[PDB]
Symmetry: C3
Subunit: 307 residues, 3 copies
């Protein structure tokens, strides 16, 4: 019955494609779709920091005719231990969708399990699915057909972006490669889900510790922070392992000539990515960030007309 979006494969390949096509339509006509007219509300809850997600969601919602109630969960009664399920049943009386940036996926599942409106993952510890929709809209407007392109991700292969690039990348027909060192590879379960979905789309999943091989011939190079939110006090050395995986000019010179570079941001310039690459001719980082707005609006128009 009600459609949620907690992870990238919650959209079938055909569904993802309808979303991305609508994304491109909304980018060209931003304020003419008003499913939340009223204004109907949408909850937008943050447990972690945000710039791109906060702005793109709040504005998108307003552009759909609705009203984002944007909160830090700590100042809600979640900070005083109201259960996630009571919260979600309450929010279901006020809003038409619940967008949440959180820690463990289990938290999203708890709310999704009783909510009577779409729950949307605005970033968890294990996935960042709205980002990869914006990533894919950006690749599509630059390259055309998504099916059969090669995309390589570099760095922490166990974080939310690695995971979502895998699931959303194969959902789109894309051969995805994760280049990561050995403490830091995708979760087996996510890798299994990606392989499962790739079978239906013609895609493939490669996981390697050879950055040079991952880069070579690639159509899209992607990276992300070596230390994500939640990982600060994990005690690991998060510099030494990742140095070989830095997205720099040696690396990019191995890719296909028309290759593009993505980074979800915020970037720690000099670490995972260098200035010359980020501010170079291949970077699509600013268009990528912008698409957060157009992609999430499409997602929401699509989820709402199905719920």
């Amino acid at each position: 019955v009600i459609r949620h979006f907690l992870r990238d494969d919650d959209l079938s390949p055909a569904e993802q494609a309808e979303v991305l096509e609508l994304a491109a339509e909304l980018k060209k006509d931003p304020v003419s779709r008003r499913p939340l007219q009223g204004p109907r509300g949408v909850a937008v809850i943050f447990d972690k920091n945000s710039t791109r997600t906060r702005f793109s969601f709040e504005l998108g919602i307003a552009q759909l005719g609705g009203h984002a109630v944007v909160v830090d969960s700590g100042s809600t009664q979640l900070g005083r231990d109201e259960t996630l399920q009571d919260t979600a049943k309450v929010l279901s009386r006020y809003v038409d969708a619940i967008v949440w940036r959180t820690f463990g996926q289990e938290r999203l599942d708890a709310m999704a399990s009783v909510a009577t409106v779409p729950v949307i993952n605005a970033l968890s510890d294990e996935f960042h699915p709205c980002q990869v929709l914006a990533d894919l809209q950006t690749i599509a407007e630059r390259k055309g057909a998504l099916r059969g392109l090669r995309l390589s991700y570099f760095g922490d292969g166990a974080n939310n972006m690695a995971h979502s690039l895998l699931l959303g990348g194969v959902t789109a027909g894309i051969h995805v490669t994760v280049a990561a060192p050995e403490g830091f590879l995708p979760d087996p379960s996510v890798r299994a889900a990606a392989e499962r979905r790739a079978q239906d789309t013609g895609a493939s999943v490669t996981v390697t510790a050879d950055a040079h091989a991952a880069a070579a011939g690639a159509d899209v190079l992607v990276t992300d922070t070596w230390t994500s939110m939640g990982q600060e006090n994990d005690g690991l050395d998060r510099v030494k392992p990742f140095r070989p995986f830095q997205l720099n000019s040696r690396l990019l010179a191995l890719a296909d000539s028309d290759a593009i570079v993505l980074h979800c941001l915020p970037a720690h310039r000099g670490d995972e990515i260098t200035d010359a690459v980020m501010d170079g001719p291949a970077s699509a980082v600013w268009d990528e960030a912008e698409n957060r707005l157009h992609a999430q609006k499409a997602l929401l128009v699509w989820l709402l007309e199905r719920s």
Copy 2:
């Protein structure tokens, strides 16, 4: 000139009836009254946690045509000791009403003493009058006439809910009973005010330490947390005295067969209310929370046309 809503008896019986009738009408047509179109502003200021108050005011104001400016007081100049009177005088220059969730009642009185727009209590240590209007709206849509109903509240009978249920209840013509251990009875001057208001409406006020007597034949049964915001560090055991006052199936079984159960939320499941009661057939808990939206809109409309 100027009507504030700082505690429940700030409305007369006839006025409360006007507000509740309008609450009913706005539930039916939520966007048909737009007295704040423009948008005009309303200030919504939080010194404490919230989910239901935050969402229902922010959205209810937007559906009245207006725009809520929602802030934690700690990031305003209130956090650098600007006085409450200066703050109120300045806010009366931007917004058409000031909604404030705070501690001592005296702080609301300080703002209401100089403000030139309605000040509205969105919870204080002593009263929670917007909650009780939602309660009454939910009672009325389930049972019809309010006059003559029998309501009992259980638990911490010294808290804002107990005071507000006593005052809003008897204003509605409802026989109110507060059932609580000896060390947590209503403030006697609140209780006296309630007895005075009861003489006008045919209501009554009862304070009891016997839960079973309070449940017997009750039409509505209400409870709330046993540790309110601001009580966390009073050092008292706030489980043991309250156990006999728990709202569970055996207590509920004593009530009228058509009795309903209310809880303002957030609930501590297994303490003041059991899963079995809260999720049972008698529970009006979620309609109650929805009715915050409607009741506060009605309240806003009424106050604005009188100020």
Copy 3:
């Protein structure tokens, strides 16, 4: 191309009069200009506490038909060290202007250097130009023309208000005097720029340690806090030096008989300004606060049609 408002002299004198003429028209017809209709977004970012700037900007954007995204910067990725240039380039994809209350002026220069939308100083350690636009509107509406009035500022002559009164005063043709102890004097390059602007408008700049001589004959007396945000820990006694500079009944008695008193707020009553003055017949303080709303809206309309 694109006009920023980082400091008062960013407007030439003809441009400032355009903005203030607009302010007065918008005070009379507040929803008559909708350039942000859509809604288009505007970033409103806080590094420091705020009441007046928060409410005036948020509501004023809404009244121009747009949507303000209001954030404390600690919650954004600025809190996790994303560079200002990256933040600005990203915001430029989402919003139509960036309003920022911050610390060093160089942070605003950093953003404005790469931003493709107008950056607007909602207060920095150096300037507070939007406040002075509201100050000028409130003088104009009480005294008529601005050219050739006498304005005196008292207290910390090196703070952001001293600098804006200097630059925005002379730009309006106002003879500006700063009365401050000798260790608290306007930054030399701000005084120079003010002297240079005064030559084009026929105004003048005076700086003195003599509070009595500064009050004698003044049309406008202005003060501000002795310890601004950010100065709490400089090690200075910030009471003893400024006592001779207190805006009290004695000093007001020296002014022109039709003099007005202004104070940006928040006020530490009993320090820089007394109750008798603040609350007496010369005080234009509440109207001054309200005019933040009208003056910022005009500035936004004006900047947007030129960017």
